Design a binder for these strands. Structure first.
Ligand SMILES: [Mg+2]
Ligand SMILES: [Mg+2]
Ligand SMILES: [Mg+2]
Ligand SMILES: [Mg+2]
Ligand SMILES: [Mg+2]
Ligand SMILES: [Mg+2]
Ligand SMILES: [Mg+2]
Ligand SMILES: [Mg+2]
Ligand SMILES: [Mg+2]
Ligand SMILES: [Mg+2]
Ligand SMILES: [Mg+2]
Ligand SMILES: [Mg+2]
Ligand SMILES: [Mg+2]
Ligand SMILES: [Mg+2]
Ligand SMILES: [Mg+2]
Ligand SMILES: [Mg+2]
Ligand SMILES: [Mg+2]
Ligand SMILES: [Mg+2]
Ligand SMILES: [Mg+2]
Ligand SMILES: [Mg+2]
Ligand SMILES: [Mg+2]
Ligand SMILES: [Mg+2]
Ligand SMILES: [Mg+2]
Ligand SMILES: [Mg+2]
Ligand SMILES: [Mg+2]
Ligand SMILES: [Mg+2]
Ligand SMILES: [Mg+2]
Ligand SMILES: [Mg+2]
Ligand SMILES: [Mg+2]
Ligand SMILES: [Mg+2]
Ligand SMILES: [Mg+2]
Ligand SMILES: [Mg+2]
Ligand SMILES: [Mg+2]
Ligand SMILES: [Mg+2]
Ligand SMILES: [Mg+2]
Ligand SMILES: [Mg+2]
Ligand SMILES: [Mg+2]
Ligand SMILES: [Mg+2]
Ligand SMILES: [Mg+2]
Ligand SMILES: [Mg+2]
Ligand SMILES: [Mg+2]
Ligand SMILES: [Mg+2]
Ligand SMILES: [Mg+2]
Ligand SMILES: [Mg+2]
Ligand SMILES: [Mg+2]
Ligand SMILES: [Mg+2]
Ligand SMILES: [Mg+2]
Ligand SMILES: [Mg+2]
Ligand SMILES: [Mg+2]
Ligand SMILES: [Mg+2]
Lengths: 67, 60, 144, 185
RNA sequence: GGACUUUUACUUUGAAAAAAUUAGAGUGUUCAAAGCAGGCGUAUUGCUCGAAUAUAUUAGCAUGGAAUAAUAGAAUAGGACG
RNA sequence: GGAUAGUGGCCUACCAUGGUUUCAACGGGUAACGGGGAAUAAGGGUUCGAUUCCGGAGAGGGAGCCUGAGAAACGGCUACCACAUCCAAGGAAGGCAGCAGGCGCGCAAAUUACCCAAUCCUAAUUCAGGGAGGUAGUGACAAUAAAUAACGAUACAGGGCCCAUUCGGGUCUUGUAAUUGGAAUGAGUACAAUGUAAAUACCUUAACGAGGAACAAUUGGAGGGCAAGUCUGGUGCCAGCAGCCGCGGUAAUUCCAGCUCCAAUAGCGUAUAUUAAAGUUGUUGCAGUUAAAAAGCUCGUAGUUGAACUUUGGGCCCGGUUGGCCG
């Protein structure tokens, strides 16, 4: 079996030059898991329709519960 | 010419030929081995030579 | 040196003369006139699917004596009406009026086949299930 | 929008569909070398024809022409390298000669039989295709390998399978398991 | 640097010339269609071959040829040299 | 002169009468985007190119324009035209010839999946984003390699062969065999590790996994062209076959089947087109007395074509590249 190998001069140099899927692969980094791809996108697209902080629109919509 | 001829008899002969079902027979080899079979049948040990040669004769 | 101009600068005359006489070639003329697209029941396409109007019994030509079991079909892209043969013993049992059949050519560049007078097509499928499979009985016609 | 992964086909198909002579000769060729297709013959005659063609095109050039020398030689040293072209007749007019059998004789199919090791072109097929025999420690299982002359010396059964040590194989080990389970305990 | 020059066709060689395609060299993708790899050791601290060549025409450019084909010249000499 | 980033009838003012055309202008057709290219292999050709690269054009149809270095932009606006959505009837919103996915059309074409790991691209930027692009799914589009079996023994049968006065079998095997014999292997299934962004497959490989009831090859064909029956049963100018010539009306070599057989074989038939065959488009390379085809005749312009002749002959030098006889 023919492969390829890298050996770094330190372990900080490996952690800082290595693809983060190999650090995951070995045992040197967690796999910070996130939403689906189109999930994050949909969150962005939601978030484009709001201009400003957003809590101001909760309080302005809070006034819509009355009338 | 004629375009409105009878249509009842469509399918006649197939419908009145007697069903004979196939017969269960030795499995013939597939691929290279069949070619081998052809080679030894056509050339190696030969068959008849009644005048010349034949391949699918009945009674002769 | 009969006919053709032999000279070294008469390439114009030779080209044109060829152009003109290509037109006497029946298939160059067809291709250039667009007959395919203009006449012809298919679009120029290889096949065409239509609807069965009526079931015909065409009497064959001489010196043959048969009844040739066909179908008049109206093409879905044209509404053009076309009388098409139903090949193999039976099969006219398989069609029925208003059914949806896939007509193909007869393999004679236009032109009717054998003794079937003026039939330039043949049925390949009914109801999306192909004569051949039905005739042998590999398939069975759809519900309706 | 990616580079076209290019391809071509490897056989041609006879102009005359039903020629008894050509069908006889072709068949003998399949039963002599243990081929399964007329394609296995067509493919090789396709190679022969592209060779013969280049050979003719080169032969029409002037002798000592730079291309004729460069490409002609490469083709000749190539045909010698595998075992189709003899050392004696090593100057492209024999490559213009040549024939299909000279190509057929060089297959790993036919070689594994040729120095014993099989004693049937068909036993040769089944052996090769079944992962036995190799060149280096490199197993090959393609009947049309074509034995590269200087690897003729390395045609042996492979480190694995029977016939070359390592194991009998799950057939025989099942039978040895039937003896050890029935006769003893 | 100054002063002027009858016009062409043909052919030769050469420049300018994308890649993939075709033709084709090298390389054993296990074979093959392919791909442009790969091959050597001290296989514990590197060594190294490559990634060619061909076609690429008609037009334009650039050089050699002077056969074959045209073209212009001096006859109211308003001709040529000084 | 104005206008443009700038040349220009690009535009305006004045002035003139010019420009193109049988060497085919102008107009019409194109089921026309152009090229690199593709299919067909004596050559000359013929046909094709919506489509992986380059150039152009468009973003439902037109026009207009803002921003800007750059757009006459459409995943920008503005107006009209054609579509068309939501509503509380006041109004408001949409432009898949991006990715997938739907309807329609049809002979005719796949997942509303995963990822930025790679190739590269953009920004303020190593990091963020990318339906570019990559991964899998669908996928007999074309292309590659090539399992469906291999080997003994036995029962006669031989063909051999030495001998033959004559049983004959015995060695060297040719194989048709209705009992046999142990061998081999991935198709599949599946620890593991490899793979990968994560997966899935491949390449590896523990445990499994072939005897006919499989893990069981097909598609056409068997009168001719054209490779394979004059077998049996059926039908009886019917039903049907038949590219073509032709088969079928009672012993059908073409139909319907059974048997056997042929060809190609994980592929084979059909239809449409086209290329070859086609020297049936003929430049190479056709034909025109009677087979298709010299205009009733002569003039004649465009066009094509067009007799011979002008430094030929001799002399000298220079240096190359093959080949010989020697090295
Ligand atoms: Mg995101
Ligand atoms: Mg934001
Ligand atoms: Mg005419
Ligand atoms: Mg006609
Ligand atoms: Mg009618
Ligand atoms: Mg193994
Ligand atoms: Mg040149
Ligand atoms: Mg200007
Ligand atoms: Mg005027
Ligand atoms: Mg005028
Ligand atoms: Mg004209
Ligand atoms: Mg168009
Ligand atoms: Mg075109
Ligand atoms: Mg194009
Ligand atoms: Mg189109
Ligand atoms: Mg330009
Ligand atoms: Mg649209
Ligand atoms: Mg726009
Ligand atoms: Mg855009
Ligand atoms: Mg309009
Ligand atoms: Mg209201
Ligand atoms: Mg879409
Ligand atoms: Mg869009
Ligand atoms: Mg997009
Ligand atoms: Mg399809
Ligand atoms: Mg779809
Ligand atoms: Mg990326
Ligand atoms: Mg994507
Ligand atoms: Mg994409
Ligand atoms: Mg699949
Ligand atoms: Mg099978
Ligand atoms: Mg097994
Ligand atoms: Mg089995
Ligand atoms: Mg069959
Ligand atoms: Mg025959
Ligand atoms: Mg007739
Ligand atoms: Mg009969
Ligand atoms: Mg027949
Ligand atoms: Mg029959
Ligand atoms: Mg074929
Ligand atoms: Mg020819
Ligand atoms: Mg003709
Ligand atoms: Mg010529
Ligand atoms: Mg010739
Ligand atoms: Mg003729
Ligand atoms: Mg006449
Ligand atoms: Mg006359
Ligand atoms: Mg006249
Ligand atoms: Mg002359
Ligand atoms: Mg001289």
């Amino acid at each position: 079996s023919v492969g390829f190998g890298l050996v770094y001069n330190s372990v900080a140099e490996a952690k800082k030059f290595e693809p983060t899927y190999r650090l995951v692969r070995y045992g040197l980094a967690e796999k910070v898991e996130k939403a689906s791809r189109q999930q994050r996108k949909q969150k962005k697209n939601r978030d484009k329709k709001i201009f400003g902080t957003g809590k101001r629109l909760a309080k302005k919509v809070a006034r819509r519960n009355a009338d | 010419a004629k375009v409105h001829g009878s249509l009842a008899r469509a399918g006649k002969v197939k419908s009145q030929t007697p069903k004979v079902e196939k017969t269960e027979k030795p499995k013939k080899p597939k691929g290279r081995a069949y070619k081998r079979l052809l080679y030894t049948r056509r050339f190696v040990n030969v068959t008849l030579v009644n005048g010349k040669r034949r391949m699918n004769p009945g009674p002769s | 040196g009969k006919g053709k101009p032999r000279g070294l600068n008469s390439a114009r005359k030779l080209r044109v003369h060829r152009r003109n006489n290509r037109w006497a070639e029946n298939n160059y003329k067809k291709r250039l006139l667009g007959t395919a697209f203009k006449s012809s029941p298919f679009g120029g396409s290889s096949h065409a699917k239509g609807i069965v109007l009526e079931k015909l019994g065409i009497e064959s030509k001489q010196p043959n004596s048969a009844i040739r079991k066909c179908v008049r079909v109206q093409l879905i892209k044209n509404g053009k009406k076309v009388t098409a043969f139903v090949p193999n013993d039976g099969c006219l049992n398989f069609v029925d009026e208003n059914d949806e059949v896939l007509l193909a050519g007869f393999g004679r560049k236009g032109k009717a086949k054998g003794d079937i007078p003026g039939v330039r097509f043949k049925v390949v499928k009914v109801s999306g299930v192909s004569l051949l499979a039905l005739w042998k009985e590999k398939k069975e016609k759809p519900r309706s | 929008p990616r580079a076209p992964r290019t391809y071509s086909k490897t056989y041609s198909t006879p102009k005359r569909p039903y020629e008894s002579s050509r069908l006889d000769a072709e068949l003998k060729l399949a039963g002599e070398f243990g081929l399964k297709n007329k394609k296995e013959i067509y493919r090789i005659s396709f190679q022969l024809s592209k060779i013969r063609r280049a050979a003719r095109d080169l032969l029409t050039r002037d002798e000592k022409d730079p291309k004729r020398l460069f490409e002609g030689n490469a083709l000749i040293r190539r045909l010698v390298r595998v075992g189709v072209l003899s050392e004696d007749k090593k100057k492209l007019d024999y490559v213009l000669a040549l024939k299909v059998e000279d190509f057929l004789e060089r297959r790993l199919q036919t070689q594994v039989y040729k120095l014993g090791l099989a004693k049937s072109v068909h036993h040769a097929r089944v052996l090769i295709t079944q992962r036995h025999i190799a060149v280096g420690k490199q197993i090959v299982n393609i009947p049309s390998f074509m034995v590269r002359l200087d690897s003729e010396k390395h045609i042996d059964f492979a480190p694995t399978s029977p016939f070359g040590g390592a194991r009998p194989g799950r057939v025989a080990r099942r039978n040895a398991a039937r003896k050890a389970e029935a006769s003893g305990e």
